[PDB]
Amino acid sequence: LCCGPKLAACGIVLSAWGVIMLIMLGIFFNVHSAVLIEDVPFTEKDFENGPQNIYNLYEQVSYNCFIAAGLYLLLGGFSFCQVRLN
């Protein structure tokens, strides 16, 4: 699937940005950072007993971030293969 080198360069730079920033976001969520509390998809019931439920939700969002990072890793690999093609 040959394409213009400019698009491949944009794809690889976006892939690097996504991988780095989403890996950092996943690490920060998994650390249960309070700064990102607003992004955690919790509900009222989660404030019943203790913070363990919110910790689990933090971990779930971190897993989502890592999945996004992996998808962007695949995208960057595709872009690098296209660059090697060109």
Partner: protein, 80 residues
């Protein structure tokens, strides 16, 4: 979480003073000695002023942060 205002002030003051005062004398002689020394001194002055303003604005607060009850509940458990 007692952030004493002695280690930060001493450390940053001495660091930026060494960069802005001691730094110029260590710049190797050459065509760019003057511009490099100006860069050193100006960076020291600007960065130290910015950090000093930032730290002093927080010293002696006249009111505390307004935190939602959800984030207050979380912060009680999490933060020190």
């Amino acid at each position: 979480t007692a952030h004493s205002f002695a280690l930060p002030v001493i450390i940053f003051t001495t660091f930026w003073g060494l960069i802005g005062i001691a730094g110029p004398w260590f710049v190797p002689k050459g065509p760019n000695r003057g511009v490099i020394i100006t860069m050193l001194v100006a960076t020291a002055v600007c960065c130290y002023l910015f950090w000093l303003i930032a730290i002093l604005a927080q010293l002696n607060p006249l009111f505390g942060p307004q935190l939602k009850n959800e984030t207050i509940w979380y912060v009680r458990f999490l933060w020190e």
